[PDB]
Amino acid sequence: SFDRLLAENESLQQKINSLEVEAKRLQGFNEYVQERLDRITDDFVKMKDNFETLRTELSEAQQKLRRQQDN
Amino acid sequence: SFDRLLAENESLQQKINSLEVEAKRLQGFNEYVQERLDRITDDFVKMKDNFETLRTELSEAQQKLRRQQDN
């Protein structure tokens, strides 16, 4: 009577193979990336803000240093 | 006869709910993150190498500029 669900039984098992291999491996990667997703941000976003300071300063500094840079 | 597989039939369907919702959503995130994983790297790794140059230069530049910075 419930023979179609039996036909789906062999279908489920093989269909899940694509899922268990995918979702799990994914989670491992998402676990890995999450570490650097946060860690990179700080050193990145802060160093950009910190970079403009060094940039403008040095950018003018360089034009003056080419005149007298410990000379 | 194959009644146990029928018992597993109702088990498969409900077990896959946790997978289809997980793996797929994951893939969407991994698709998203992949864009920034590469994009951040360049601006990050290169700006670090570029930062040491600006750092040392300005670091000495600042000590000289406090003597004469367009004065």
Swiss-Prot record, chains A, B:
Stretches that traverse the bilayer: none
Subcellular localization(s) per the UniProt record: Nucleus
Oligomer status and interactors: May be a homo- or heterodimer.
Function comment: Has a role in localizing bicoid mRNA at the anterior margin of the oocyte during oogenesis, and a poorly characterized role in nuclear divisions in early embryogenesis.
Name of the protein in question: Protein swallow
Source species: Drosophila melanogaster
GN (gene name): swa
Range within the parent protein: 205 to 275 of 548
